[PDB]
Amino acid sequence: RILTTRNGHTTSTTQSSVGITHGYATAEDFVNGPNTSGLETRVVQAERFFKTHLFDWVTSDPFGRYYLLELPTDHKGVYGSLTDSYAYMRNGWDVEVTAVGNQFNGGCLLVAMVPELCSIEQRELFQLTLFPHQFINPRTNMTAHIKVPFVGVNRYDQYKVHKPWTLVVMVVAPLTVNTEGAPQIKVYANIAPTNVHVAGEFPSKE
Amino acid sequence: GIFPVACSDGYGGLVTTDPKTADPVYGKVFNPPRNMLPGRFTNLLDVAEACPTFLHFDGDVPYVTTKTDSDRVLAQFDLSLAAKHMSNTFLAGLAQYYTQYSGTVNLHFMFTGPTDAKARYMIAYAPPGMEPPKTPEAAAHCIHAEWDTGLNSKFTFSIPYLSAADYAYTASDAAETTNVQGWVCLFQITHGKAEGDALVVLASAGKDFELRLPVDARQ
Amino acid sequence: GIFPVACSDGYGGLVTTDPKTADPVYGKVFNPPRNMLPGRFTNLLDVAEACPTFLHFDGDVPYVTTKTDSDRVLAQFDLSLAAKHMSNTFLAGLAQYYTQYSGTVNLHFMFTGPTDAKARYMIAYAPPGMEPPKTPEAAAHCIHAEWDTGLNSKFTFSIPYLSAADYAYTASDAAETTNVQGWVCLFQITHGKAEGDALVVLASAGKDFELRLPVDARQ
Amino acid sequence: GIFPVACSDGYGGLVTTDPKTADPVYGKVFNPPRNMLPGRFTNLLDVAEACPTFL
Amino acid sequence: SGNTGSIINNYYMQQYQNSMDTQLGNDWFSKLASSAFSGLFGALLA
Amino acid sequence: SGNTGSIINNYYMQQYQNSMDTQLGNDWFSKLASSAFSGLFGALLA
Amino acid sequence: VQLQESGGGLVQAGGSLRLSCAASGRTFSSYAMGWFRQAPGSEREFVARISWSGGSTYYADSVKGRFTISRDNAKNTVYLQMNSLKPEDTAVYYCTAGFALPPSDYWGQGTQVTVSS
Amino acid sequence: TTSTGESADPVTATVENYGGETQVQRRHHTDVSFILDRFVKVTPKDSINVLDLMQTPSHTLVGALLRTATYYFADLEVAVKHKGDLTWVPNGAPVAALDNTTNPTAYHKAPLTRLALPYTAPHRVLATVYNGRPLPTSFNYGAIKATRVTELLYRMKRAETYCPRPLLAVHPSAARHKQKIVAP
Amino acid sequence: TTSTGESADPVTATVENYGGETQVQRRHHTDVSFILDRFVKVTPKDSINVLDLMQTPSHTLVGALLRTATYYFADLEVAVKHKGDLTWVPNGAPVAALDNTTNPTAYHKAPLTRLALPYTAPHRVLATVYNGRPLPTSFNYGAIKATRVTELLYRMKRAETYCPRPLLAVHPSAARHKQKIVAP
């Protein structure tokens, strides 16, 4: 089960993979709206991966351990500069999460892209599967991969005051080493924007 | 003259759910075009079929761990949408707003253990009228399925809708001592080296699951 | 019998804006023929597109005079129809009776100076989210235009409608510290011998300017 | 204007046997299929003709 | 033409509900606004 | 579409009774639930 | 971004006061600065203005020539020097920041000034 | 887009200049006949009230938008809350006529009474501003009388406007006009 | 029926596996537009009430089913019992507007007053949860004012929902949730 994902000039390869999960739609909605007067433009060079650490998943974590990551995040590449040079943006997210133990570890993780995530209740986590997701079961896959479009009450959003998507990673079953597995598993994420569009150049600082 | 008419008694009183429209006050507004936004759902069951959710077990965890002892009953609970186990699911989320349901309720099982551990499980349906089975050998006479761990980590089992009346109440009446819809029982046949390994379970509507008669129960 | 009917509750109360007609009392009158009188307008926006009006500046004059100093900012103001500068225009006259608008707002510039004086100007749009530019070099990165004096005395610049939501409020909410629609900035690049010479400015609706949801705000 | 009408006296009072229907409150329910159950009678005389009884 | 929501014909004749117009023998401003010049007056570059 | 019991046309124009939609340029979840796999993944016996 | 007035007090006619306003939270040298005054029972009226460069000013007619506005971008503050005070000038004096020809938004709490006669 | 400003010919530049694209407009809400058709309150007088559109306050939505046209035409709908019998009289009829039930008279029926009235003036089209402060007595739809009138409303029908005039907004003291907007 | 659970692809097994037969379904009662169209009570405030769908209690049938979708659209019908004259105002209009009879105003007619209101918000579709506890002031249908309002109801029309969210039931202490069911 080999899968190669290419965004821009960057790639990723996974020999143990369950496939891709397309959230809420297969393709972006209409980009050119009445609200921008057609002054929007697509930024090609901004679409590419970037890597970030999430947490360390250890046996002590019980069920319910969760990690919020809000998107977009602080980004020092081209995608970060755009947020400072343009007052209106939109984009979809192609998200990939990687937790590598060996196949003798046990427990399971649930990763999900949750739009508009504010203070989810503890009981509400049992229904968390409603959002796009994949399970990371060290018995099988080391990788979870999710693609979701841009959602919001506006056609273009201002990422300073609003973060539409929140990556959340929850522990459905606690880790077990069973003496043959990795003592702990570190969780990383490899994320790329998609279909970025911008409008409304700011002035500069000078 | 003019067209005569009869104003009838007992008609015209306002009804909160009535099927008729208000008189428009303020006209000629246009909406901002919303066409083809992502992630639309027109029916609250479709989101229940396409997005399974976790159950609830002792210790408040959505999974049950393998056990080594003479006791092979892994988990056992009523079949109802008012059960404590179902309480956190989305499926049992809609139920509280409807009185009656019919159709199949699917359960999803995913084995989380390491690649060197193997187990074999049994799910079974105990219809009402008799105490549910306490041993897999006793349950083997019911409707049941059996699966084990391997390359595929997930198993899906459809719990039939089997009842005298074509529909069944969602809520559980206080005067009901024993569940009317019977029980479902989950057993552990055996396990290779699986001690301390977790099995997460999920639940979602089936193909034929149908839910009717909306009601506001508070809750 | 006679055709029965049900008088419904919550219907029939008078509505000031309701869409229905009174019962005629007094009939058969003829109007004096008014056909093809001059100067008719059926829509209050068309008169806003075809008749630009003056803005308002310090000293209460509808023009801004060239300045010689290190300060090249000629005039700077919020983009809103509640602004003080726009307040005297006809365009901002209709706004107060509508909640929301969208589309382009055109600005007209006419250089009044003598034939021996020449200047060169820059208009620019500063979108919201960052402080507006204080220098033409800083503004040169925004959307902008640049023109100078000559045979033609007038320049016309279309300020785009650029926003997240398809419509924008006319009024300015008291809890809004910084303008939501951003600013427009007018600069003086340089001037030949133009000291003390006036530039009058005008404003009128664009092609796509649209205004909706009437409301009576007092005012 | 709007279509005028005359509310007539002596009409509209409720009648226990009246031939008209209530305004539906709560819609879109489906019955469990009952078709061809045994022993149906649509008229209370037919059961009087086909089932004599004692004096 | 104005704000009216009736999809059925008015119960009263057009002659009563309204005053009848007569003839003799957005009109101006829309015909004015439609003639607005959207072009560029000078040569375009790039 | 919703809960409405009138077999006769609404007295007021569609333009008043409701807000008029516009266009530009169960949908997702029913198209998702219709793709559910009902089959058996392995060989069947008996 | 918050402003704080100061330098208010009491005085008698012909006196003088120097009001002080400190700015916080963002660049002060990018903002125009101005003063408003609300005399009790009248609505609040405009006073004076200073551009970020300190170059350009504007004065209300009644205060024209009596008052002098000045800012210090180094000290992150702006000053209104009140001179030849007159019992009419009694009012609360609000310090205002802003972009527009009138400074408008970002108001301080204002200080009390009462000239007596 | 440069041109000669002194021409007064309308010149509308568009976003396509710097590379935008003009969008679609729906102007229904600014239509004259649409926006002016609705009720507006007028402070009545105890008994006799001459029907006049200039009595509407100038700051109201119907009052202001009316006064922006020199020459206006429309029918009239009134909504009155009164005691006794509301009697209406056509334009130019003597005041002594309001006491005759033969003239159109609406017997009291709670809560209020709505009428539809034709354009009764002799002039082909009325005017908001007249050059001759006062406006000629011939501008009116007639008068109404009742024992007492508690409320009075005007609703214009088939409105038509000519020769627009200034329309003013509120002049802010600060850089913007800040109002408290409805919020949850 | 075995498969890979990590796929998240929906897998629905059926009774035909062990020899059953799937029956026929009629889902009308769970239809979004059908189930959300009805009145739900909201505790009013004496004079000014901003029309907002989030004021409905979360446990009510209309309140709960609403909150399970991030992005919702619908018209609105209100049923109000009030004293005086009920005045309505469109979205984003100043609070000072509610005092003008020119704005839509329903004169008191017993027992109550029912209106139908369009979707007036600028945003293409509203939201139940917003990431920015508070929700932006621009989410509302406007406000209504009266001398006093005794009751207030909301009825959604043409409801449309997007991106579902958790829906929770009551968590029993015992093995079941036992309630007293209507019985003769």
mmCIF file with all atom_site columns, N, CA, C and O in Angstrom, chain A residues 24 29-30 63 103-105 107-108 126-127 129-130 135 137 139 155 172 174 176, chain B residues 33 36 39 52-55 62-63 88-90 110-112 114-116 149-150:
data_model
loop_
_atom_site.group_PDB
_atom_site.id
_atom_site.type_symbol
_atom_site.label_atom_id
_atom_site.label_alt_id
_atom_site.label_comp_id
_atom_site.label_asym_id
_atom_site.label_entity_id
_atom_site.label_seq_id
_atom_site.pdbx_PDB_ins_code
_atom_site.Cartn_x
_atom_site.Cartn_y
_atom_site.Cartn_z
_atom_site.occupancy
_atom_site.B_iso_or_equiv
_atom_site.pdbx_formal_charge
_atom_site.auth_seq_id
_atom_site.auth_comp_id
_atom_site.auth_asym_id
_atom_site.auth_atom_id
_atom_site.pdbx_PDB_model_num
ATOM 1   N N  . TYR A 1 24  ? -16.073 16.551  3.431  1.00 0.00 ? 24  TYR A N  1
ATOM 2   C CA . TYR A 1 24  ? -17.128 17.517  3.141  1.00 0.00 ? 24  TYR A CA 1
ATOM 3   C C  . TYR A 1 24  ? -17.301 17.867  1.670  1.00 0.00 ? 24  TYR A C  1
ATOM 4   O O  . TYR A 1 24  ? -18.332 18.435  1.297  1.00 0.00 ? 24  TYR A O  1
ATOM 5   N N  . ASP A 1 29  ? -15.325 24.937  -3.828 1.00 0.00 ? 29  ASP A N  1
ATOM 6   C CA . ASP A 1 29  ? -16.467 25.654  -4.366 1.00 0.00 ? 29  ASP A CA 1
ATOM 7   C C  . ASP A 1 29  ? -15.992 26.803  -5.254 1.00 0.00 ? 29  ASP A C  1
ATOM 8   O O  . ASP A 1 29  ? -14.815 26.906  -5.603 1.00 0.00 ? 29  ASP A O  1
ATOM 9   N N  . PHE A 1 30  ? -16.922 27.668  -5.648 1.00 0.00 ? 30  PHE A N  1
ATOM 10  C CA . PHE A 1 30  ? -16.569 28.798  -6.497 1.00 0.00 ? 30  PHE A CA 1
ATOM 11  C C  . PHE A 1 30  ? -15.593 29.724  -5.793 1.00 0.00 ? 30  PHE A C  1
ATOM 12  O O  . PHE A 1 30  ? -15.850 30.192  -4.682 1.00 0.00 ? 30  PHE A O  1
ATOM 13  N N  . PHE A 1 63  ? -7.776  7.479   27.896 1.00 0.00 ? 63  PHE A N  1
ATOM 14  C CA . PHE A 1 63  ? -8.731  7.895   26.886 1.00 0.00 ? 63  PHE A CA 1
ATOM 15  C C  . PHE A 1 63  ? -9.115  9.344   27.123 1.00 0.00 ? 63  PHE A C  1
ATOM 16  O O  . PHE A 1 63  ? -9.200  9.793   28.266 1.00 0.00 ? 63  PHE A O  1
ATOM 17  N N  . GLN A 1 103 ? 5.231   -2.330  14.866 1.00 0.00 ? 103 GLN A N  1
ATOM 18  C CA . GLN A 1 103 ? 3.952   -3.012  14.768 1.00 0.00 ? 103 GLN A CA 1
ATOM 19  C C  . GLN A 1 103 ? 3.578   -3.765  16.035 1.00 0.00 ? 103 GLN A C  1
ATOM 20  O O  . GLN A 1 103 ? 2.489   -4.342  16.086 1.00 0.00 ? 103 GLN A O  1
ATOM 21  N N  . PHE A 1 104 ? 4.441   -3.793  17.043 1.00 0.00 ? 104 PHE A N  1
ATOM 22  C CA . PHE A 1 104 ? 4.126   -4.459  18.297 1.00 0.00 ? 104 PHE A CA 1
ATOM 23  C C  . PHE A 1 104 ? 3.544   -3.526  19.345 1.00 0.00 ? 104 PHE A C  1
ATOM 24  O O  . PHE A 1 104 ? 3.172   -3.991  20.424 1.00 0.00 ? 104 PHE A O  1
ATOM 25  N N  . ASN A 1 105 ? 3.465   -2.234  19.068 1.00 0.00 ? 105 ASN A N  1
ATOM 26  C CA . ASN A 1 105 ? 2.743   -1.312  19.926 1.00 0.00 ? 105 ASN A CA 1
ATOM 27  C C  . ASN A 1 105 ? 1.244   -1.498  19.764 1.00 0.00 ? 105 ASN A C  1
ATOM 28  O O  . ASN A 1 105 ? 0.768   -2.094  18.796 1.00 0.00 ? 105 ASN A O  1
ATOM 29  N N  . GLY A 1 107 ? -2.893  0.234   21.061 1.00 0.00 ? 107 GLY A N  1
ATOM 30  C CA . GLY A 1 107 ? -3.616  1.472   21.225 1.00 0.00 ? 107 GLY A CA 1
ATOM 31  C C  . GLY A 1 107 ? -3.958  2.064   19.876 1.00 0.00 ? 107 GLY A C  1
ATOM 32  O O  . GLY A 1 107 ? -3.579  1.547   18.829 1.00 0.00 ? 107 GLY A O  1
ATOM 33  N N  . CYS A 1 108 ? -4.709  3.155   19.916 1.00 0.00 ? 108 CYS A N  1
ATOM 34  C CA . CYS A 1 108 ? -5.202  3.720   18.672 1.00 0.00 ? 108 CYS A CA 1
ATOM 35  C C  . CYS A 1 108 ? -5.389  5.215   18.845 1.00 0.00 ? 108 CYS A C  1
ATOM 36  O O  . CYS A 1 108 ? -5.595  5.690   19.959 1.00 0.00 ? 108 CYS A O  1
ATOM 37  N N  . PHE A 1 126 ? -17.150 11.301  22.278 1.00 0.00 ? 126 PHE A N  1
ATOM 38  C CA . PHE A 1 126 ? -17.627 10.022  21.782 1.00 0.00 ? 126 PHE A CA 1
ATOM 39  C C  . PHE A 1 126 ? -18.222 10.125  20.388 1.00 0.00 ? 126 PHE A C  1
ATOM 40  O O  . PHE A 1 126 ? -18.215 9.132   19.658 1.00 0.00 ? 126 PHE A O  1
ATOM 41  N N  . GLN A 1 127 ? -18.745 11.287  20.011 1.00 0.00 ? 127 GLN A N  1
ATOM 42  C CA . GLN A 1 127 ? -19.315 11.495  18.688 1.00 0.00 ? 127 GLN A CA 1
ATOM 43  C C  . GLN A 1 127 ? -18.328 12.160  17.739 1.00 0.00 ? 127 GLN A C  1
ATOM 44  O O  . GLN A 1 127 ? -18.704 12.540  16.629 1.00 0.00 ? 127 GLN A O  1
ATOM 45  N N  . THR A 1 129 ? -16.298 11.228  15.764 1.00 0.00 ? 129 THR A N  1
ATOM 46  C CA . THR A 1 129 ? -16.159 10.630  14.442 1.00 0.00 ? 129 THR A CA 1
ATOM 47  C C  . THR A 1 129 ? -17.004 11.315  13.381 1.00 0.00 ? 129 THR A C  1
ATOM 48  O O  . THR A 1 129 ? -16.821 11.016  12.198 1.00 0.00 ? 129 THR A O  1
ATOM 49  N N  . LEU A 1 130 ? -17.928 12.201  13.761 1.00 0.00 ? 130 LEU A N  1
ATOM 50  C CA . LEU A 1 130 ? -18.756 12.875  12.769 1.00 0.00 ? 130 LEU A CA 1
ATOM 51  C C  . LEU A 1 130 ? -17.931 13.708  11.806 1.00 0.00 ? 130 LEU A C  1
ATOM 52  O O  . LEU A 1 130 ? -18.339 13.902  10.661 1.00 0.00 ? 130 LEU A O  1
ATOM 53  N N  . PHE A 1 135 ? -8.355  6.566   11.633 1.00 0.00 ? 135 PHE A N  1
ATOM 54  C CA . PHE A 1 135 ? -7.728  5.973   12.796 1.00 0.00 ? 135 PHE A CA 1
ATOM 55  C C  . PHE A 1 135 ? -6.275  5.642   12.494 1.00 0.00 ? 135 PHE A C  1
ATOM 56  O O  . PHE A 1 135 ? -5.945  5.146   11.417 1.00 0.00 ? 135 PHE A O  1
ATOM 57  N N  . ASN A 1 137 ? -3.833  3.071   13.805 1.00 0.00 ? 137 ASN A N  1
ATOM 58  C CA . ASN A 1 137 ? -3.734  1.848   14.592 1.00 0.00 ? 137 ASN A CA 1
ATOM 59  C C  . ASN A 1 137 ? -2.366  1.245   14.332 1.00 0.00 ? 137 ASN A C  1
ATOM 60  O O  . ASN A 1 137 ? -2.121  0.711   13.239 1.00 0.00 ? 137 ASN A O  1
ATOM 61  N N  . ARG A 1 139 ? -1.016  -1.334  14.811 1.00 0.00 ? 139 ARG A N  1
ATOM 62  C CA . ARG A 1 139 ? -1.113  -2.646  14.201 1.00 0.00 ? 139 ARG A CA 1
ATOM 63  C C  . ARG A 1 139 ? -1.073  -2.579  12.685 1.00 0.00 ? 139 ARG A C  1
ATOM 64  O O  . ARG A 1 139 ? -0.568  -3.507  12.051 1.00 0.00 ? 139 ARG A O  1
ATOM 65  N N  . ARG A 1 155 ? -16.825 34.065  1.885  1.00 0.00 ? 155 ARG A N  1
ATOM 66  C CA . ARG A 1 155 ? -16.145 33.394  0.788  1.00 0.00 ? 155 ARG A CA 1
ATOM 67  C C  . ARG A 1 155 ? -14.640 33.552  0.895  1.00 0.00 ? 155 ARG A C  1
ATOM 68  O O  . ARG A 1 155 ? -13.894 32.650  0.504  1.00 0.00 ? 155 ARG A O  1
ATOM 69  N N  . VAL A 1 172 ? -8.073  7.184   21.538 1.00 0.00 ? 172 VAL A N  1
ATOM 70  C CA . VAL A 1 172 ? -9.207  6.302   21.748 1.00 0.00 ? 172 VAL A CA 1
ATOM 71  C C  . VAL A 1 172 ? -8.827  5.084   22.576 1.00 0.00 ? 172 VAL A C  1
ATOM 72  O O  . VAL A 1 172 ? -9.656  4.555   23.315 1.00 0.00 ? 172 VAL A O  1
ATOM 73  N N  . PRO A 1 174 ? -5.348  3.569   25.003 1.00 0.00 ? 174 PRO A N  1
ATOM 74  C CA . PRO A 1 174 ? -4.026  3.954   25.501 1.00 0.00 ? 174 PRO A CA 1
ATOM 75  C C  . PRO A 1 174 ? -2.940  3.059   24.930 1.00 0.00 ? 174 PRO A C  1
ATOM 76  O O  . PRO A 1 174 ? -3.196  1.936   24.496 1.00 0.00 ? 174 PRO A O  1
ATOM 77  N N  . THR A 1 176 ? 0.235   0.583   24.559 1.00 0.00 ? 176 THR A N  1
ATOM 78  C CA . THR A 1 176 ? 0.768   -0.590  25.236 1.00 0.00 ? 176 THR A CA 1
ATOM 79  C C  . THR A 1 176 ? 2.009   -1.052  24.489 1.00 0.00 ? 176 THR A C  1
ATOM 80  O O  . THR A 1 176 ? 1.973   -1.269  23.277 1.00 0.00 ? 176 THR A O  1
ATOM 81  N N  . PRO B 2 33  ? -24.739 35.186  -2.917 1.00 0.00 ? 33  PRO B N  1
ATOM 82  C CA . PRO B 2 33  ? -24.803 33.843  -3.500 1.00 0.00 ? 33  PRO B CA 1
ATOM 83  C C  . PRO B 2 33  ? -24.026 32.842  -2.662 1.00 0.00 ? 33  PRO B C  1
ATOM 84  O O  . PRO B 2 33  ? -22.828 32.999  -2.422 1.00 0.00 ? 33  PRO B O  1
ATOM 85  N N  . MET B 2 36  ? -23.189 25.962  -3.861 1.00 0.00 ? 36  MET B N  1
ATOM 86  C CA . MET B 2 36  ? -22.125 24.961  -3.724 1.00 0.00 ? 36  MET B CA 1
ATOM 87  C C  . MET B 2 36  ? -21.082 25.352  -2.676 1.00 0.00 ? 36  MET B C  1
ATOM 88  O O  . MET B 2 36  ? -19.887 25.453  -2.951 1.00 0.00 ? 36  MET B O  1
ATOM 89  N N  . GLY B 2 39  ? -19.575 20.683  2.317  1.00 0.00 ? 39  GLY B N  1
ATOM 90  C CA . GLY B 2 39  ? -20.090 20.028  3.503  1.00 0.00 ? 39  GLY B CA 1
ATOM 91  C C  . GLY B 2 39  ? -21.543 20.282  3.811  1.00 0.00 ? 39  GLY B C  1
ATOM 92  O O  . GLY B 2 39  ? -21.865 20.675  4.932  1.00 0.00 ? 39  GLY B O  1
ATOM 93  N N  . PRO B 2 52  ? -19.707 7.341   11.993 1.00 0.00 ? 52  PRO B N  1
ATOM 94  C CA . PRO B 2 52  ? -19.888 6.617   13.250 1.00 0.00 ? 52  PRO B CA 1
ATOM 95  C C  . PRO B 2 52  ? -19.192 7.322   14.400 1.00 0.00 ? 52  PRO B C  1
ATOM 96  O O  . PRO B 2 52  ? -18.256 8.098   14.206 1.00 0.00 ? 52  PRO B O  1
ATOM 97  N N  . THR B 2 53  ? -19.665 7.044   15.612 1.00 0.00 ? 53  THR B N  1
ATOM 98  C CA . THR B 2 53  ? -19.149 7.686   16.808 1.00 0.00 ? 53  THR B CA 1
ATOM 99  C C  . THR B 2 53  ? -18.933 6.659   17.907 1.00 0.00 ? 53  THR B C  1
ATOM 100 O O  . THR B 2 53  ? -19.399 5.525   17.828 1.00 0.00 ? 53  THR B O  1
ATOM 101 N N  . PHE B 2 54  ? -18.220 7.083   18.944 1.00 0.00 ? 54  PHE B N  1
ATOM 102 C CA . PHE B 2 54  ? -17.753 6.164   19.971 1.00 0.00 ? 54  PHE B CA 1
ATOM 103 C C  . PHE B 2 54  ? -18.848 5.820   20.966 1.00 0.00 ? 54  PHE B C  1
ATOM 104 O O  . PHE B 2 54  ? -19.790 6.586   21.169 1.00 0.00 ? 54  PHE B O  1
ATOM 105 N N  . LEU B 2 55  ? -18.710 4.659   21.595 1.00 0.00 ? 55  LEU B N  1
ATOM 106 C CA . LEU B 2 55  ? -19.568 4.271   22.700 1.00 0.00 ? 55  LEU B CA 1
ATOM 107 C C  . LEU B 2 55  ? -18.945 4.689   24.026 1.00 0.00 ? 55  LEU B C  1
ATOM 108 O O  . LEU B 2 55  ? -17.959 5.425   24.079 1.00 0.00 ? 55  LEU B O  1
ATOM 109 N N  . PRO B 2 62  ? -13.973 4.848   25.511 1.00 0.00 ? 62  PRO B N  1
ATOM 110 C CA . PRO B 2 62  ? -14.736 4.245   24.422 1.00 0.00 ? 62  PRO B CA 1
ATOM 111 C C  . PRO B 2 62  ? -14.068 3.004   23.883 1.00 0.00 ? 62  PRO B C  1
ATOM 112 O O  . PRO B 2 62  ? -13.940 2.854   22.666 1.00 0.00 ? 62  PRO B O  1
ATOM 113 N N  . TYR B 2 63  ? -13.641 2.104   24.752 1.00 0.00 ? 63  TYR B N  1
ATOM 114 C CA . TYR B 2 63  ? -13.053 0.855   24.309 1.00 0.00 ? 63  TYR B CA 1
ATOM 115 C C  . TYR B 2 63  ? -13.116 -0.142  25.445 1.00 0.00 ? 63  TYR B C  1
ATOM 116 O O  . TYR B 2 63  ? -13.295 0.219   26.609 1.00 0.00 ? 63  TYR B O  1
ATOM 117 N N  . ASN B 2 88  ? -23.322 8.716   24.447 1.00 0.00 ? 88  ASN B N  1
ATOM 118 C CA . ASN B 2 88  ? -22.431 9.681   23.826 1.00 0.00 ? 88  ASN B CA 1
ATOM 119 C C  . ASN B 2 88  ? -22.480 9.673   22.307 1.00 0.00 ? 88  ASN B C  1
ATOM 120 O O  . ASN B 2 88  ? -21.982 10.615  21.688 1.00 0.00 ? 88  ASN B O  1
ATOM 121 N N  . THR B 2 89  ? -23.074 8.660   21.691 1.00 0.00 ? 89  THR B N  1
ATOM 122 C CA . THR B 2 89  ? -23.059 8.589   20.242 1.00 0.00 ? 89  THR B CA 1
ATOM 123 C C  . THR B 2 89  ? -23.879 9.719   19.640 1.00 0.00 ? 89  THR B C  1
ATOM 124 O O  . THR B 2 89  ? -24.729 10.322  20.293 1.00 0.00 ? 89  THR B O  1
ATOM 125 N N  . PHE B 2 90  ? -23.596 10.016  18.373 1.00 0.00 ? 90  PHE B N  1
ATOM 126 C CA . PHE B 2 90  ? -24.457 10.925  17.628 1.00 0.00 ? 90  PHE B CA 1
ATOM 127 C C  . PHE B 2 90  ? -25.803 10.283  17.347 1.00 0.00 ? 90  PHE B C  1
ATOM 128 O O  . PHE B 2 90  ? -26.837 10.953  17.390 1.00 0.00 ? 90  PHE B O  1
ATOM 129 N N  . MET B 2 110 ? -12.828 -2.050  16.113 1.00 0.00 ? 110 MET B N  1
ATOM 130 C CA . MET B 2 110 ? -11.485 -1.884  15.578 1.00 0.00 ? 110 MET B CA 1
ATOM 131 C C  . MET B 2 110 ? -10.476 -2.305  16.630 1.00 0.00 ? 110 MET B C  1
ATOM 132 O O  . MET B 2 110 ? -10.441 -1.731  17.720 1.00 0.00 ? 110 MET B O  1
ATOM 133 N N  . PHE B 2 111 ? -9.654  -3.295  16.300 1.00 0.00 ? 111 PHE B N  1
ATOM 134 C CA . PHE B 2 111 ? -8.688  -3.821  17.251 1.00 0.00 ? 111 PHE B CA 1
ATOM 135 C C  . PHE B 2 111 ? -7.421  -2.986  17.229 1.00 0.00 ? 111 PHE B C  1
ATOM 136 O O  . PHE B 2 111 ? -6.807  -2.794  16.183 1.00 0.00 ? 111 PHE B O  1
ATOM 137 N N  . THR B 2 112 ? -7.044  -2.472  18.390 1.00 0.00 ? 112 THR B N  1
ATOM 138 C CA . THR B 2 112 ? -5.961  -1.513  18.488 1.00 0.00 ? 112 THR B CA 1
ATOM 139 C C  . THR B 2 112 ? -4.619  -2.139  18.837 1.00 0.00 ? 112 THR B C  1
ATOM 140 O O  . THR B 2 112 ? -3.591  -1.461  18.743 1.00 0.00 ? 112 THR B O  1
ATOM 141 N N  . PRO B 2 114 ? -1.065  -4.474  19.362 1.00 0.00 ? 114 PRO B N  1
ATOM 142 C CA . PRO B 2 114 ? 0.155   -4.547  18.554 1.00 0.00 ? 114 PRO B CA 1
ATOM 143 C C  . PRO B 2 114 ? 0.108   -5.721  17.595 1.00 0.00 ? 114 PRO B C  1
ATOM 144 O O  . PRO B 2 114 ? -0.720  -6.622  17.703 1.00 0.00 ? 114 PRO B O  1
ATOM 145 N N  . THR B 2 115 ? 1.037   -5.700  16.638 1.00 0.00 ? 115 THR B N  1
ATOM 146 C CA . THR B 2 115 ? 0.997   -6.670  15.551 1.00 0.00 ? 115 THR B CA 1
ATOM 147 C C  . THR B 2 115 ? 1.289   -8.086  16.025 1.00 0.00 ? 115 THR B C  1
ATOM 148 O O  . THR B 2 115 ? 1.022   -9.045  15.298 1.00 0.00 ? 115 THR B O  1
ATOM 149 N N  . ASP B 2 116 ? 1.841   -8.245  17.225 1.00 0.00 ? 116 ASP B N  1
ATOM 150 C CA . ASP B 2 116 ? 2.200   -9.562  17.729 1.00 0.00 ? 116 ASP B CA 1
ATOM 151 C C  . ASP B 2 116 ? 1.113   -10.175 18.604 1.00 0.00 ? 116 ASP B C  1
ATOM 152 O O  . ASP B 2 116 ? 1.307   -11.265 19.147 1.00 0.00 ? 116 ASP B O  1
ATOM 153 N N  . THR B 2 149 ? -8.433  -11.030 14.602 1.00 0.00 ? 149 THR B N  1
ATOM 154 C CA . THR B 2 149 ? -7.543  -9.957  14.204 1.00 0.00 ? 149 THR B CA 1
ATOM 155 C C  . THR B 2 149 ? -6.664  -10.386 13.044 1.00 0.00 ? 149 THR B C  1
ATOM 156 O O  . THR B 2 149 ? -6.405  -11.569 12.828 1.00 0.00 ? 149 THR B O  1
ATOM 157 N N  . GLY B 2 150 ? -6.181  -9.394  12.309 1.00 0.00 ? 150 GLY B N  1
ATOM 158 C CA . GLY B 2 150 ? -5.408  -9.673  11.112 1.00 0.00 ? 150 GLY B CA 1
ATOM 159 C C  . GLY B 2 150 ? -5.071  -8.395  10.385 1.00 0.00 ? 150 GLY B C  1
ATOM 160 O O  . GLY B 2 150 ? -5.011  -7.319  10.986 1.00 0.00 ? 150 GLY B O  1
#
